Design a protein around this ligand. Structure first.
Ligand SMILES: [Cl-]
Ligand SMILES: [Cu+2]
Length: 122
């Protein structure tokens, strides 16, 4: 299955959001990150992807597709926008949950990450 996440200047959260900010997928599913507004990209957060996964970064304004196979959670962010974060989960029972939760990010970023994990049933 293929999923799309859009990058928007405004959400129910406030400024700068991935929509949806959380997605649970099966191994081998894909997500394409699609800027709706200009000035956004996507990249994995340092330390916040599973063993077996590779890091990634898109260019500003680029449509960017990623295939997720390694099981676990994947914290993603948008470079120019500090609060703009999201979580992709592959499978149930992710093993690197504490890598996202135990992080010490700006409050707003951390609450968005924590909310994403909780919405994923963790
Ligand atoms: Cl593009
Ligand atoms: Cu952004």
């Amino acid at each position: 299955a293929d999923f799309e996440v859009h990058m928007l200047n405004k959400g129910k959260d406030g400024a700068m959001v991935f929509e949806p900010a959380s997605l649970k997928v099966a191994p081998g599913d894909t997500v394409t990150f699609i800027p709706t507004d200009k000035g956004h990209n996507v990249e994995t957060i340092k330390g916040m992807i599973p063993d077996g996964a590779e890091a990634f970064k898109s260019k500003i304004n680029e449509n960017y597709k990623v295939t997720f196979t390694a099981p676990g959670v994947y914290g993603v962010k948008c470079t120019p926008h500090p609060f703009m974060v999201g979580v992709v989960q592959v499978g149930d029972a992710p093993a690197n949950l504490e890598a996202v939760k135990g992080a010490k990010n700006p409050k707003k970023a951390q609450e968005r990450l924590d909310a994403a994990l909780a919405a994923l049933g963790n």
